[PDB]
Structures are given as C-alpha cells and as structure tokens.
UniProtKB/Swiss-Prot annotation:
This is General odorant-binding protein lush. The gene is lush. Belongs to the PBP/GOBP family. Odorant-binding protein required for olfactory behavior and for activity of pheromone-sensitive neurons. Binds to alcohols and mediates avoidance behavior to high concentrations of alcohols, the alcohol-binding possibly resulting in activation of receptors on T2B neurons, the activation of these receptors inhibiting these neurons. Acts in concert with Snmp and lush to capture cVA molecules on the surface of Or67d expressing olfactory dendrites and facilitate their transfer to the odorant-receptor Orco complex. Required for cVA response, probably by binding to VA. It comes from Drosophila melanogaster. The lineage of its organism: Eukaryota, Metazoa, Ecdysozoa, Arthropoda, Hexapoda. The keyword Transport applies. The keyword Nuclease does not apply.
Length: 124
C-alpha cells in the first residue's frame, strides 16, 4: 500500500471498531498520534483489541503472534513504515505475557509499540 492509502485506512479501521465501544473523541485523537500517555478506560483497551484482531496480529485471548504480525505487515503498513513496525514487533513481542486479560494484553502491547516507535506512530 501507499502512504496515502495507509492514512485513509486508519479511519476505515476505526469505523469497524469504534461503534462497538463507548469512547471519548479526545482519547481517540491521542491514540491516532501515538500518545498513549493517559489512563485508558476498559472500552478504549478493548478498542485496541478490536483493531489488532482486524489486523490478524492477536487471537481472541489477546496473545500477540509476532510471526503472523510480520507476515501481515506488508499488507498493513506502507514500505516507509515497515522497518519501524518490525522493530516495534520485535521489541514488544513478549509484552502480552505480563498481563492476563485479553484487552489489557493488547492495549499494553500497542502502548509498547508507541513507546518503541523510532518515528511517528499512528493508531487507527
């Protein structure tokens, strides 16, 4: 995909997930720019799970599948963002193991993605 297609995909991904949850716009604005530095509601955590399920990167237990994530990346992110993403996948592959609940596992993994990102990070 191209950068242009990627940026637009963020909104299409969000539309598939956001209506299932009770979410604040200001929260979603902050995740969109990769700012995970605020306490999340359980709804927002489960939102990150719905998004990550859509990518095929986690199972329903919130377990992060790094081999599958890497195999999917060519279809998830533009070439410009590939290296950053692969670096975040590697650095955060075992984040989920410190948590028990599926929404928590995924949210903390996405937060880790955002904190390890060596460039601009964008969440749907």
């Amino acid at each position: 995909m191209t950068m242009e297609q990627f940026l637009t995909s963020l909104d299409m991904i969000r539309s598939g997930c956001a209506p299932k949850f009770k979410l604040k716009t200001e929260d979603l604005d902050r995740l969109r720019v990769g700012d995970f530095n605020f306490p999340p509601s359980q709804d927002l955590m489960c939102y990150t799970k719905c998004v990550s399920l859509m990518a095929g990167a986690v199972n329903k237990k919130g377990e992060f599948n790094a081999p599958k994530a890497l195999a999917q990346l060519p279809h998830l992110v533009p070439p410009e963002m590939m290296e950053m993403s692969r670096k975040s996948v590697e650095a955060c592959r075992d984040t989920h193991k410190q948590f028990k609940e599926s929404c928590e596992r995924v949210y903390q993994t996405a937060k880790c993605f955002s904190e390890n990102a060596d460039g601009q990070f964008m969440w749907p």
